[PDB]
Amino acid sequence: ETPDVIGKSVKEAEQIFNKNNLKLGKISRSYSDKYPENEIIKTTPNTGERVERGDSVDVVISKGPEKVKMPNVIGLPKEEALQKLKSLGLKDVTIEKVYNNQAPKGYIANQSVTATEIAIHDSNIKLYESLGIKQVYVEDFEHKSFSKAKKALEEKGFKVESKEEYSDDIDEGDVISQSPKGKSVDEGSTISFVVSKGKKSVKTTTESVDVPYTGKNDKSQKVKVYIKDKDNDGSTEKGSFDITSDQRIDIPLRIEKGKTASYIVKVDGKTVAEKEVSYD
Ligand SMILES: [Eu+2]
Ligand SMILES: [Eu+2]
Ligand SMILES: [Eu+2]
Ligand SMILES: [Eu+2]
């Protein structure tokens, strides 16, 4: 009767067969998850099946788990991702939904197994499907205190920006306007505020500068005057006009106590003149 060599090596199996007056038969190789590579998987005849003196016994050997190359599915829609996995015999796939900022809602943000040889049985792939970015509600603070606005929205993860403007009907430090507001938007979004610095209720200079024209083809040049003073942060131009000849230009500046104001005059993008002026 056929001896049991299952889980054994070929080396040992032939030893057991010879001892039993039998020959090692043909050797073939099969993928297996149950048996470590180069262990007997199966015999013909099977263990305990009747045999006669000198008959051979064929053996099948483990080539270890059958494997594939893990595909890259990050950024594909869920169903494309799963199909691409099935197409390789990878069917043990669990989905986990998470918020994410790289892949849109319904698209795979992450793979368990990096884009590697994997066994096609009990592979335990996990795919992380994006729910999009977490939506957080932006509290509408129009006509309320900016300080409270900034702080409340900071604590919900928002980035807060503000410029200031004069107002006759909105208390100092109260919000003229807010964008966005009254709405849920992506976590961490920037909320923009226009804030009241009270009513337009400082010294005064008119500075003169001669701007030369340096253009070609009898074509005008564009002059841009940028001012930093009481109510101007030199952000955008306080003056914008074309020049076709030398022009004397006057630049009104209003300066607080203990401060300096300044002007820059550019001509076709290039600085031509600049000056600092103190509250004198
Ligand atoms: Eu028997
Ligand atoms: Eu191998
Ligand atoms: Eu499994
Ligand atoms: Eu000419």
PDB file of C-alpha atoms and ligand atoms in Angstrom:
ATOM      1  CA  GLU A   1       0.000   0.000   0.000  1.00  0.00           C
ATOM      2  CA  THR A   2       1.091   3.537  -0.879  1.00  0.00           C
ATOM      3  CA  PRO A   3       3.068   5.262   1.965  1.00  0.00           C
ATOM      4  CA  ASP A   4       2.325   8.811   3.186  1.00  0.00           C
ATOM      5  CA  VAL A   5       4.929  11.363   2.068  1.00  0.00           C
ATOM      6  CA  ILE A   6       2.608  14.378   2.064  1.00  0.00           C
ATOM      7  CA  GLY A   7       4.353  17.536   3.347  1.00  0.00           C
ATOM      8  CA  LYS A   8       7.731  15.786   2.943  1.00  0.00           C
ATOM      9  CA  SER A   9      10.650  16.554   0.586  1.00  0.00           C
ATOM     10  CA  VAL A  10      11.529  14.568  -2.588  1.00  0.00           C
ATOM     11  CA  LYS A  11      14.763  13.577  -0.858  1.00  0.00           C
ATOM     12  CA  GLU A  12      12.793  11.978   2.029  1.00  0.00           C
ATOM     13  CA  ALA A  13       9.957  10.657  -0.185  1.00  0.00           C
ATOM     14  CA  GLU A  14      12.285   8.530  -2.354  1.00  0.00           C
ATOM     15  CA  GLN A  15      13.847   7.250   0.863  1.00  0.00           C
ATOM     16  CA  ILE A  16      10.358   6.180   2.102  1.00  0.00           C
ATOM     17  CA  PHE A  17       9.466   4.674  -1.328  1.00  0.00           C
ATOM     18  CA  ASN A  18      12.680   2.633  -1.679  1.00  0.00           C
ATOM     19  CA  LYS A  19      12.334   1.270   1.835  1.00  0.00           C
ATOM     20  CA  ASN A  20       8.792   0.204   0.836  1.00  0.00           C
ATOM     21  CA  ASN A  21       9.967  -1.538  -2.389  1.00  0.00           C
ATOM     22  CA  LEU A  22       8.561   1.244  -4.662  1.00  0.00           C
ATOM     23  CA  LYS A  23      10.094   3.749  -7.085  1.00  0.00           C
ATOM     24  CA  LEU A  24       9.932   7.533  -7.149  1.00  0.00           C
ATOM     25  CA  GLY A  25       7.762   8.253 -10.184  1.00  0.00           C
ATOM     26  CA  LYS A  26       7.362  11.479 -12.084  1.00  0.00           C
ATOM     27  CA  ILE A  27       7.866  14.821 -10.338  1.00  0.00           C
ATOM     28  CA  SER A  28       5.565  17.718 -11.140  1.00  0.00           C
ATOM     29  CA  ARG A  29       5.065  21.167  -9.597  1.00  0.00           C
ATOM     30  CA  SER A  30       1.924  22.946  -8.508  1.00  0.00           C
ATOM     31  CA  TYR A  31       1.194  26.212  -6.743  1.00  0.00           C
ATOM     32  CA  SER A  32      -0.039  25.769  -3.143  1.00  0.00           C
ATOM     33  CA  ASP A  33      -0.894  28.007  -0.204  1.00  0.00           C
ATOM     34  CA  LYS A  34      -1.358  25.027   2.147  1.00  0.00           C
ATOM     35  CA  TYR A  35       2.225  23.668   1.736  1.00  0.00           C
ATOM     36  CA  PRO A  36       5.592  25.518   1.892  1.00  0.00           C
ATOM     37  CA  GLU A  37       7.594  25.377  -1.450  1.00  0.00           C
ATOM     38  CA  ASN A  38       9.220  21.939  -2.162  1.00  0.00           C
ATOM     39  CA  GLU A  39       7.082  19.868   0.076  1.00  0.00           C
ATOM     40  CA  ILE A  40       4.962  17.012  -1.425  1.00  0.00           C
ATOM     41  CA  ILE A  41       1.383  18.203  -2.141  1.00  0.00           C
ATOM     42  CA  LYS A  42      -0.181  15.037  -3.547  1.00  0.00           C
ATOM     43  CA  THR A  43       0.783  11.526  -4.643  1.00  0.00           C
ATOM     44  CA  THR A  44      -0.446   9.056  -7.245  1.00  0.00           C
ATOM     45  CA  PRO A  45      -1.444   6.567  -5.993  1.00  0.00           C
ATOM     46  CA  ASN A  46      -2.770   8.434  -2.910  1.00  0.00           C
ATOM     47  CA  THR A  47      -1.630   7.420   0.591  1.00  0.00           C
ATOM     48  CA  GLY A  48      -3.070   4.026   1.504  1.00  0.00           C
ATOM     49  CA  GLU A  49      -4.146   3.238  -2.086  1.00  0.00           C
ATOM     50  CA  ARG A  50      -3.208  -0.334  -3.130  1.00  0.00           C
ATOM     51  CA  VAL A  51       0.137  -0.858  -4.887  1.00  0.00           C
ATOM     52  CA  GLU A  52       2.405  -3.764  -6.023  1.00  0.00           C
ATOM     53  CA  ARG A  53       6.135  -4.419  -5.504  1.00  0.00           C
ATOM     54  CA  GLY A  54       8.179  -2.153  -7.724  1.00  0.00           C
ATOM     55  CA  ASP A  55       5.334   0.110  -8.888  1.00  0.00           C
ATOM     56  CA  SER A  56       6.288   3.825  -9.058  1.00  0.00           C
ATOM     57  CA  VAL A  57       4.630   6.675  -7.176  1.00  0.00           C
ATOM     58  CA  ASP A  58       4.253  10.048  -8.873  1.00  0.00           C
ATOM     59  CA  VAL A  59       4.635  13.158  -6.707  1.00  0.00           C
ATOM     60  CA  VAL A  60       3.423  16.744  -6.979  1.00  0.00           C
ATOM     61  CA  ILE A  61       5.624  19.386  -5.265  1.00  0.00           C
ATOM     62  CA  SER A  62       4.644  22.845  -3.910  1.00  0.00           C
ATOM     63  CA  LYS A  63       5.874  25.891  -5.832  1.00  0.00           C
ATOM     64  CA  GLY A  64       4.543  27.945  -2.917  1.00  0.00           C
ATOM     65  CA  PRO A  65       1.690  30.475  -3.238  1.00  0.00           C
ATOM     66  CA  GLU A  66       0.687  31.649  -6.741  1.00  0.00           C
ATOM     67  CA  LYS A  67       1.482  35.402  -6.911  1.00  0.00           C
ATOM     68  CA  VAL A  68       0.844  38.558  -9.011  1.00  0.00           C
ATOM     69  CA  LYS A  69       2.238  42.085  -9.320  1.00  0.00           C
ATOM     70  CA  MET A  70       0.064  44.467  -7.299  1.00  0.00           C
ATOM     71  CA  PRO A  71      -1.374  47.072  -9.702  1.00  0.00           C
ATOM     72  CA  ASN A  72      -1.402  50.834  -8.967  1.00  0.00           C
ATOM     73  CA  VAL A  73      -5.056  51.772  -8.368  1.00  0.00           C
ATOM     74  CA  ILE A  74      -4.544  54.977  -6.359  1.00  0.00           C
ATOM     75  CA  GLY A  75      -6.595  57.805  -7.862  1.00  0.00           C
ATOM     76  CA  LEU A  76      -8.942  55.595  -9.944  1.00  0.00           C
ATOM     77  CA  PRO A  77     -12.704  55.425  -9.205  1.00  0.00           C
ATOM     78  CA  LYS A  78     -13.653  52.551  -6.860  1.00  0.00           C
ATOM     79  CA  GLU A  79     -15.111  50.231  -9.499  1.00  0.00           C
ATOM     80  CA  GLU A  80     -12.170  50.652 -11.939  1.00  0.00           C
ATOM     81  CA  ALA A  81      -9.852  49.845  -9.002  1.00  0.00           C
ATOM     82  CA  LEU A  82     -11.726  46.622  -8.127  1.00  0.00           C
ATOM     83  CA  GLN A  83     -12.030  45.420 -11.719  1.00  0.00           C
ATOM     84  CA  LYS A  84      -8.259  45.951 -12.222  1.00  0.00           C
ATOM     85  CA  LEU A  85      -7.730  43.787  -9.122  1.00  0.00           C
ATOM     86  CA  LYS A  86     -10.144  41.023 -10.217  1.00  0.00           C
ATOM     87  CA  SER A  87      -8.511  41.022 -13.671  1.00  0.00           C
ATOM     88  CA  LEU A  88      -5.490  39.542 -11.859  1.00  0.00           C
ATOM     89  CA  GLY A  89      -7.492  37.137  -9.657  1.00  0.00           C
ATOM     90  CA  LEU A  90      -7.284  39.465  -6.625  1.00  0.00           C
ATOM     91  CA  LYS A  91     -10.761  39.186  -5.099  1.00  0.00           C
ATOM     92  CA  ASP A  92     -10.167  39.444  -1.309  1.00  0.00           C
ATOM     93  CA  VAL A  93     -10.536  43.238  -1.136  1.00  0.00           C
ATOM     94  CA  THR A  94     -11.942  45.245   1.732  1.00  0.00           C
ATOM     95  CA  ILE A  95     -12.944  48.933   1.347  1.00  0.00           C
ATOM     96  CA  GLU A  96     -12.489  51.597   4.045  1.00  0.00           C
ATOM     97  CA  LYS A  97     -13.915  55.072   3.571  1.00  0.00           C
ATOM     98  CA  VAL A  98     -11.844  57.998   4.803  1.00  0.00           C
ATOM     99  CA  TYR A  99     -11.701  61.688   4.187  1.00  0.00           C
ATOM    100  CA  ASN A 100      -8.815  62.603   1.943  1.00  0.00           C
ATOM    101  CA  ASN A 101      -7.334  65.673   0.138  1.00  0.00           C
ATOM    102  CA  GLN A 102      -5.552  64.034  -2.800  1.00  0.00           C
ATOM    103  CA  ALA A 103      -8.335  61.927  -4.397  1.00  0.00           C
ATOM    104  CA  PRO A 104     -11.914  63.079  -5.006  1.00  0.00           C
ATOM    105  CA  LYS A 105     -14.987  61.475  -3.384  1.00  0.00           C
ATOM    106  CA  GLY A 106     -15.396  57.879  -4.649  1.00  0.00           C
ATOM    107  CA  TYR A 107     -11.729  57.510  -5.713  1.00  0.00           C
ATOM    108  CA  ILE A 108      -9.041  55.354  -4.083  1.00  0.00           C
ATOM    109  CA  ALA A 109      -6.726  57.379  -1.799  1.00  0.00           C
ATOM    110  CA  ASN A 110      -4.456  54.504  -0.672  1.00  0.00           C
ATOM    111  CA  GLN A 111      -3.524  50.831  -1.189  1.00  0.00           C
ATOM    112  CA  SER A 112      -2.747  48.309   1.526  1.00  0.00           C
ATOM    113  CA  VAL A 113      -0.160  46.664  -0.726  1.00  0.00           C
ATOM    114  CA  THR A 114       2.318  48.899  -2.563  1.00  0.00           C
ATOM    115  CA  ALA A 115       2.226  48.949  -6.361  1.00  0.00           C
ATOM    116  CA  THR A 116       4.944  44.029  -5.242  1.00  0.00           C
ATOM    117  CA  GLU A 117       4.315  40.310  -5.781  1.00  0.00           C
ATOM    118  CA  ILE A 118       1.223  39.322  -3.815  1.00  0.00           C
ATOM    119  CA  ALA A 119      -0.346  35.890  -3.273  1.00  0.00           C
ATOM    120  CA  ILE A 120      -3.772  35.705  -5.006  1.00  0.00           C
ATOM    121  CA  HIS A 121      -5.296  33.765  -2.080  1.00  0.00           C
ATOM    122  CA  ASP A 122      -6.029  35.376   1.366  1.00  0.00           C
ATOM    123  CA  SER A 123      -4.228  38.489   0.060  1.00  0.00           C
ATOM    124  CA  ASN A 124      -6.067  40.793   2.507  1.00  0.00           C
ATOM    125  CA  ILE A 125      -5.992  43.862   0.247  1.00  0.00           C
ATOM    126  CA  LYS A 126      -7.430  46.987   1.817  1.00  0.00           C
ATOM    127  CA  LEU A 127      -8.392  49.934  -0.333  1.00  0.00           C
ATOM    128  CA  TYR A 128      -9.000  53.367   1.096  1.00  0.00           C
ATOM    129  CA  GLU A 129     -11.778  55.118  -0.753  1.00  0.00           C
ATOM    130  CA  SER A 130     -11.913  58.915  -0.517  1.00  0.00           C
ATOM    131  CA  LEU A 131     -14.984  60.606   0.938  1.00  0.00           C
ATOM    132  CA  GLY A 132     -13.485  63.879  -0.344  1.00  0.00           C
ATOM    133  CA  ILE A 133     -12.286  66.527   2.105  1.00  0.00           C
ATOM    134  CA  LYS A 134     -14.170  66.816   5.387  1.00  0.00           C
ATOM    135  CA  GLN A 135     -16.882  69.502   4.999  1.00  0.00           C
ATOM    136  CA  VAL A 136     -16.972  71.971   7.859  1.00  0.00           C
ATOM    137  CA  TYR A 137     -19.692  74.557   8.298  1.00  0.00           C
ATOM    138  CA  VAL A 138     -18.576  78.204   8.021  1.00  0.00           C
ATOM    139  CA  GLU A 139     -20.437  80.206  10.654  1.00  0.00           C
ATOM    140  CA  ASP A 140     -21.839  83.482   9.290  1.00  0.00           C
ATOM    141  CA  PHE A 141     -20.410  86.267  11.413  1.00  0.00           C
ATOM    142  CA  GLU A 142     -21.466  89.240   9.261  1.00  0.00           C
ATOM    143  CA  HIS A 143     -21.940  92.301  11.510  1.00  0.00           C
ATOM    144  CA  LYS A 144     -20.438  90.508  14.524  1.00  0.00           C
ATOM    145  CA  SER A 145     -17.019  90.848  16.190  1.00  0.00           C
ATOM    146  CA  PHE A 146     -14.108  89.879  13.976  1.00  0.00           C
ATOM    147  CA  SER A 147     -12.082  88.734  17.041  1.00  0.00           C
ATOM    148  CA  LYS A 148     -14.740  86.195  17.920  1.00  0.00           C
ATOM    149  CA  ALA A 149     -15.019  85.297  14.208  1.00  0.00           C
ATOM    150  CA  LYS A 150     -11.286  84.733  13.790  1.00  0.00           C
ATOM    151  CA  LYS A 151     -11.089  82.673  16.969  1.00  0.00           C
ATOM    152  CA  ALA A 152     -14.213  80.529  16.340  1.00  0.00           C
ATOM    153  CA  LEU A 153     -13.143  79.719  12.771  1.00  0.00           C
ATOM    154  CA  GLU A 154      -9.497  79.155  13.703  1.00  0.00           C
ATOM    155  CA  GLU A 155     -10.733  76.477  16.162  1.00  0.00           C
ATOM    156  CA  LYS A 156     -12.587  74.733  13.299  1.00  0.00           C
ATOM    157  CA  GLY A 157      -9.366  74.622  11.271  1.00  0.00           C
ATOM    158  CA  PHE A 158     -10.016  77.490   8.851  1.00  0.00           C
ATOM    159  CA  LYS A 159      -7.446  79.918   7.583  1.00  0.00           C
ATOM    160  CA  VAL A 160      -8.738  83.488   8.227  1.00  0.00           C
ATOM    161  CA  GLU A 161      -7.818  86.566   6.184  1.00  0.00           C
ATOM    162  CA  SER A 162      -8.878  90.177   6.603  1.00  0.00           C
ATOM    163  CA  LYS A 163      -8.486  93.627   5.107  1.00  0.00           C
ATOM    164  CA  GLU A 164      -9.827  96.730   6.873  1.00  0.00           C
ATOM    165  CA  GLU A 165     -12.166  99.474   5.646  1.00  0.00           C
ATOM    166  CA  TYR A 166     -13.872 102.587   7.006  1.00  0.00           C
ATOM    167  CA  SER A 167     -17.538 102.312   7.931  1.00  0.00           C
ATOM    168  CA  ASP A 168     -20.125 104.687   9.312  1.00  0.00           C
ATOM    169  CA  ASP A 169     -22.639 101.973  10.279  1.00  0.00           C
ATOM    170  CA  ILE A 170     -20.373  99.122  11.506  1.00  0.00           C
ATOM    171  CA  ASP A 171     -18.576  99.268  14.884  1.00  0.00           C
ATOM    172  CA  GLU A 172     -14.810  99.114  14.965  1.00  0.00           C
ATOM    173  CA  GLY A 173     -13.686  95.472  14.779  1.00  0.00           C
ATOM    174  CA  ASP A 174     -17.033  94.244  13.487  1.00  0.00           C
ATOM    175  CA  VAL A 175     -17.290  92.409  10.164  1.00  0.00           C
ATOM    176  CA  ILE A 176     -18.439  94.320   7.097  1.00  0.00           C
ATOM    177  CA  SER A 177     -18.391  91.191   4.926  1.00  0.00           C
ATOM    178  CA  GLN A 178     -17.463  87.485   4.895  1.00  0.00           C
ATOM    179  CA  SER A 179     -16.733  84.972   2.191  1.00  0.00           C
ATOM    180  CA  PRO A 180     -17.626  82.203   2.384  1.00  0.00           C
ATOM    181  CA  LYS A 181     -20.354  82.151   5.107  1.00  0.00           C
ATOM    182  CA  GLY A 182     -23.542  80.226   5.953  1.00  0.00           C
ATOM    183  CA  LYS A 183     -22.273  77.192   4.099  1.00  0.00           C
ATOM    184  CA  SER A 184     -20.179  74.072   4.637  1.00  0.00           C
ATOM    185  CA  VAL A 185     -16.880  74.063   2.688  1.00  0.00           C
ATOM    186  CA  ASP A 186     -13.643  71.984   2.697  1.00  0.00           C
ATOM    187  CA  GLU A 187     -11.946  71.745   6.090  1.00  0.00           C
ATOM    188  CA  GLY A 188      -8.994  74.150   6.278  1.00  0.00           C
ATOM    189  CA  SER A 189     -10.369  76.522   3.654  1.00  0.00           C
ATOM    190  CA  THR A 190      -9.536  80.255   3.723  1.00  0.00           C
ATOM    191  CA  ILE A 191     -12.331  82.547   5.017  1.00  0.00           C
ATOM    192  CA  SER A 192     -11.991  86.208   3.886  1.00  0.00           C
ATOM    193  CA  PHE A 193     -13.213  89.135   6.014  1.00  0.00           C
ATOM    194  CA  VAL A 194     -13.732  92.833   5.478  1.00  0.00           C
ATOM    195  CA  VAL A 195     -13.476  94.433   8.898  1.00  0.00           C
ATOM    196  CA  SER A 196     -14.506  97.828  10.253  1.00  0.00           C
ATOM    197  CA  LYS A 197     -11.873 100.281  11.478  1.00  0.00           C
ATOM    198  CA  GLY A 198     -14.595 102.861  12.307  1.00  0.00           C
ATOM    199  CA  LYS A 199     -15.438 106.169  10.585  1.00  0.00           C
ATOM    200  CA  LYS A 200     -12.894 108.022   8.344  1.00  0.00           C
ATOM    201  CA  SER A 201     -12.597 110.540  11.217  1.00  0.00           C
ATOM    202  CA  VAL A 202      -2.625 112.793  10.344  1.00  0.00           C
ATOM    203  CA  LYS A 203      -0.679 115.435   8.375  1.00  0.00           C
ATOM    204  CA  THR A 204      -0.650 116.339   4.667  1.00  0.00           C
ATOM    205  CA  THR A 205       2.047 116.726   2.014  1.00  0.00           C
ATOM    206  CA  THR A 206       1.865 117.006  -1.735  1.00  0.00           C
ATOM    207  CA  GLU A 207       5.164 115.660  -2.998  1.00  0.00           C
ATOM    208  CA  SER A 208       6.130 116.545  -6.556  1.00  0.00           C
ATOM    209  CA  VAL A 209       8.163 114.274  -8.837  1.00  0.00           C
ATOM    210  CA  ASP A 210       9.228 114.899 -12.446  1.00  0.00           C
ATOM    211  CA  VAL A 211       8.684 111.653 -14.396  1.00  0.00           C
ATOM    212  CA  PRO A 212      10.712 111.444 -17.636  1.00  0.00           C
ATOM    213  CA  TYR A 213       9.285 109.788 -20.741  1.00  0.00           C
ATOM    214  CA  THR A 214      11.623 107.173 -22.172  1.00  0.00           C
ATOM    215  CA  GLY A 215       9.307 105.334 -24.605  1.00  0.00           C
ATOM    216  CA  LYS A 216       9.924 104.318 -28.224  1.00  0.00           C
ATOM    217  CA  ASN A 217       7.896 104.627 -31.472  1.00  0.00           C
ATOM    218  CA  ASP A 218       6.081 107.722 -30.061  1.00  0.00           C
ATOM    219  CA  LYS A 219       4.171 105.276 -27.944  1.00  0.00           C
ATOM    220  CA  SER A 220       2.957 106.059 -24.432  1.00  0.00           C
ATOM    221  CA  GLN A 221       4.401 104.522 -21.299  1.00  0.00           C
ATOM    222  CA  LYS A 222       2.295 103.545 -18.343  1.00  0.00           C
ATOM    223  CA  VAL A 223       3.020 105.125 -14.983  1.00  0.00           C
ATOM    224  CA  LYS A 224       2.020 103.436 -11.745  1.00  0.00           C
ATOM    225  CA  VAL A 225       2.370 105.235  -8.435  1.00  0.00           C
ATOM    226  CA  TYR A 226       2.320 103.130  -5.255  1.00  0.00           C
ATOM    227  CA  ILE A 227       1.894 104.853  -1.896  1.00  0.00           C
ATOM    228  CA  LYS A 228       2.485 103.710   1.698  1.00  0.00           C
ATOM    229  CA  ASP A 229       0.862 106.201   4.137  1.00  0.00           C
ATOM    230  CA  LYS A 230      -1.921 106.506   6.781  1.00  0.00           C
ATOM    231  CA  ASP A 231      -4.546 104.567   4.790  1.00  0.00           C
ATOM    232  CA  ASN A 232      -2.488 102.860   2.115  1.00  0.00           C
ATOM    233  CA  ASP A 233      -0.260  99.831   2.436  1.00  0.00           C
ATOM    234  CA  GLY A 234       1.549 100.190  -0.936  1.00  0.00           C
ATOM    235  CA  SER A 235      -0.339  97.083  -2.038  1.00  0.00           C
ATOM    236  CA  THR A 236      -1.801  98.213  -5.359  1.00  0.00           C
ATOM    237  CA  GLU A 237      -1.265 101.447  -7.298  1.00  0.00           C
ATOM    238  CA  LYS A 238      -2.650 104.727  -5.986  1.00  0.00           C
ATOM    239  CA  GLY A 239      -2.087 106.191  -9.497  1.00  0.00           C
ATOM    240  CA  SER A 240      -2.330 104.836 -13.066  1.00  0.00           C
ATOM    241  CA  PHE A 241      -1.928 106.913 -16.244  1.00  0.00           C
ATOM    242  CA  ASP A 242      -0.179 107.078 -19.612  1.00  0.00           C
ATOM    243  CA  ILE A 243       2.696 109.409 -20.370  1.00  0.00           C
ATOM    244  CA  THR A 244       3.920 110.565 -23.795  1.00  0.00           C
ATOM    245  CA  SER A 245       6.282 113.296 -22.542  1.00  0.00           C
ATOM    246  CA  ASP A 246       8.010 114.445 -19.352  1.00  0.00           C
ATOM    247  CA  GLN A 247       5.397 114.913 -16.626  1.00  0.00           C
ATOM    248  CA  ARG A 248       5.499 116.612 -13.243  1.00  0.00           C
ATOM    249  CA  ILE A 249       3.321 114.523 -10.950  1.00  0.00           C
ATOM    250  CA  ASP A 250       1.999 115.356  -7.508  1.00  0.00           C
ATOM    251  CA  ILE A 251       1.634 112.681  -4.860  1.00  0.00           C
ATOM    252  CA  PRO A 252      -0.603 113.454  -1.855  1.00  0.00           C
ATOM    253  CA  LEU A 253       0.579 111.710   1.349  1.00  0.00           C
ATOM    254  CA  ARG A 254      -1.141 111.628   4.765  1.00  0.00           C
ATOM    255  CA  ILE A 255       1.050 110.546   7.685  1.00  0.00           C
ATOM    256  CA  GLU A 256       0.263 109.695  11.353  1.00  0.00           C
ATOM    257  CA  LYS A 257       2.358 110.664  14.412  1.00  0.00           C
ATOM    258  CA  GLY A 258       5.713 108.849  14.697  1.00  0.00           C
ATOM    259  CA  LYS A 259       5.528 107.319  11.209  1.00  0.00           C
ATOM    260  CA  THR A 260       6.909 107.590   7.675  1.00  0.00           C
ATOM    261  CA  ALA A 261       5.071 107.456   4.377  1.00  0.00           C
ATOM    262  CA  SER A 262       6.645 106.624   1.014  1.00  0.00           C
ATOM    263  CA  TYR A 263       5.966 106.556  -2.737  1.00  0.00           C
ATOM    264  CA  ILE A 264       7.262 104.461  -5.597  1.00  0.00           C
ATOM    265  CA  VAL A 265       6.760 105.560  -9.191  1.00  0.00           C
ATOM    266  CA  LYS A 266       7.220 102.891 -11.885  1.00  0.00           C
ATOM    267  CA  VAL A 267       7.192 103.416 -15.681  1.00  0.00           C
ATOM    268  CA  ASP A 268       6.395 100.340 -17.776  1.00  0.00           C
ATOM    269  CA  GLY A 269       7.176  98.110 -14.754  1.00  0.00           C
ATOM    270  CA  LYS A 270      10.534  99.658 -13.854  1.00  0.00           C
ATOM    271  CA  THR A 271      11.131 101.795 -10.762  1.00  0.00           C
ATOM    272  CA  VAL A 272      12.011 105.311 -11.845  1.00  0.00           C
ATOM    273  CA  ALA A 273      11.634 107.290  -8.597  1.00  0.00           C
ATOM    274  CA  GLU A 274      11.011 106.630  -4.873  1.00  0.00           C
ATOM    275  CA  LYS A 275      11.042 108.607  -1.612  1.00  0.00           C
ATOM    276  CA  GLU A 276      10.414 108.248   2.133  1.00  0.00           C
ATOM    277  CA  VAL A 277       8.702 111.127   3.954  1.00  0.00           C
ATOM    278  CA  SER A 278       8.392 111.519   7.753  1.00  0.00           C
ATOM    279  CA  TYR A 279       5.374 113.066   9.558  1.00  0.00           C
ATOM    280  CA  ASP A 280       7.381 116.364   9.282  1.00  0.00           C
TER     281      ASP A 280
HETATM  282 EU    EU B   1      -5.613  -0.240   4.065  1.00  0.00          EU
HETATM  283 EU    EU B   2      10.330  29.596  -5.754  1.00  0.00          EU
HETATM  284 EU    EU B   3      -8.788  37.339   3.729  1.00  0.00          EU
HETATM  285 EU    EU B   4       8.702 111.332 -32.861  1.00  0.00          EU
END
